[PDB]
């Protein structure tokens, strides 16, 4: 059938007018500044996105000292690369290992590490992913083409508080002496949410 509740359903036909009406109201009252709003939009449209987290991952892969700092203090760790702020004030980095596969969700809404991954995709914020991720992780991951070994523990982290999580994926095999930049290219958004793995060369 149609999309209904997966986040990709069609908005009401008059939604853009409703939004314009409220915006005018707020501007007229002096509550908001359009110019500042434009800067906010530009920030999340062009400046902040998963490339940020990718740089964090790549650096951690090549620099064990940085990795240790990052795992000890996520916020300070990502700050070394100039990433910080709204919805990433108190970061916790989750290390994937041969024994543990991490993945995170916000069952209650949409909490997500903006400074390293940017704004979340619609699916992350919708009922299908949020409802099922905490009960049948394997079933959900299978839908993304990811099958976790049966003997590997999956840890699902529900973002119910003001801590924000990002996954440090495992470095793909056969990437010897890659530069941080080549490694960063392999780090997908999904790999940092835990709903996928880094690209295999």
């Amino acid at each position: 059938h149609d999309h209904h509740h997966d986040g990709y359903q069609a908005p009401p036909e008059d939604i853009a007018l409703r939004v314009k009406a409220l915006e005018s109201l707020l501007i007229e009252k002096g509550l908001v500044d359009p110019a500042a709003m434009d800067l906010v939009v530009q920030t999340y449209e062009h400046k902040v996105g998963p490339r940020n987290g990718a740089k964090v991952v790549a650096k951690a892969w090549v620099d064990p000292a940085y990795k240790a700092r990052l795992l000890a203090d996520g916020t300070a760790g990502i700050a070394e690369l100039g990433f910080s702020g709204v919805q990433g004030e108190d970061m916790v980095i989750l290390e994937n290992t041969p024994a543990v596969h991490n993945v995170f969700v916000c069952t209650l809404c949409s909490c997500y590490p903006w400074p390293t991954l940017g704004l979340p995709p619609a699916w992350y914020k919708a009922a299908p992913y949020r409802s099922r991720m905490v009960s049948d992780p394997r079933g959900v991951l299978a839908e993304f083409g990811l099958v976790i070994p049966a003997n590997k523990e999956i840890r699902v982290w529900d973002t119910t508080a003001e801590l924000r999580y990002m996954v440090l994926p495992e470095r793909p095999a056969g990437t010897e002496a890659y530069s941080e930049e080549q490694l960063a290219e392999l780090v997908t958004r999904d790999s940092m949410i835990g709903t996928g793995l880094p690209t295999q060369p």
Binding site: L25, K29, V40, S84, T107, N151
Partner: protein, 219 residues
């Protein structure tokens, strides 16, 4: 609040469909809606906890039918009225009652600095930590009509404290003008079996949830 937003463990929402090559913003109007949040938070028109609870309070069908940013639009149209920042009439007509009576706190000069800094919910001091990592804890069975961050699926369940994150504002009180009542927040680890039962579980899998100190009791 035991509302439709508390989705954990629900059935019937179906497959996780995902758009290939999804843009940050799928419609122009979403840009306006999204950028309004930082603007209004900066004014101190409401706090984030109030924002969350306002979304929880929209009609259940409205919540399911509405795309994500329609949730935000709802908060702006309703929470601003509840807080006395706008009147119903103003919202309905889209025409201000009496001109530019305020001054925007979020100005172009501070956008970058404000966004880069944000506002941590961590606090210097608060209630002492009752639990240590390794402690077995049970989530209290509470069913507040107001805002809370203990998901329905964890209530009454037993888990293991795996991280003490330190002291944070308490959303339950901050959303209802009862102060911050800062206290510790822990990550608590629950087994798949403990949460979902023998049949519906996988032996390896664990679910970790961040819970405030007074949500818990010794197991």
């Amino acid at each position: 609040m035991n509302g439709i937003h508390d989705t954990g463990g629900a059935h019937g929402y179906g497959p996780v469909y995902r758009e290939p090559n999804e843009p940050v913003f799928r419609y122009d109007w979403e840009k306006t809606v999204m950028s309004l949040l930082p603007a209004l938070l900066a004014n101190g028109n409401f706090n984030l906890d109030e924002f969350r609870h306002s979304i929880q309070r929209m009609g259940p069908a409205h919540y399911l039918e509405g795309t994500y940013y329609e949730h935000w639009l709802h908060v702006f149209e309703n929470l601003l009225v509840e807080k006395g920042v706008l009147t119903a009439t103003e919202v309905a007509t889209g025409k201000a009652a009496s001109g530019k009576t305020a001054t925007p706190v979020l100005t172009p000069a501070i956008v970058d600095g404000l966004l880069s800094t944000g506002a941590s919910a961590a606090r210097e001091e608060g209630a002492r930590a009752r639990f240590a990592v390794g402690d077995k804890v049970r989530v209290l069975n509470k069913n507040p009509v107001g805002h809370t961050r203990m998901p329905r699926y964890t209530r009454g369940k037993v888990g293991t404290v795996v991280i003490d994150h330190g002291v944070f504002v308490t959303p339950d009180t901050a959303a209802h003008g009862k102060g911050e009542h800062p206290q510790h927040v822990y990550t608590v680890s629950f087994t798949s079996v403990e949460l979902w039962g023998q049949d519906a579980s996988s032996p390896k899998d664990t679910i970790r949830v961040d819970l405030w100190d007074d949500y818990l009791e010794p197991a």
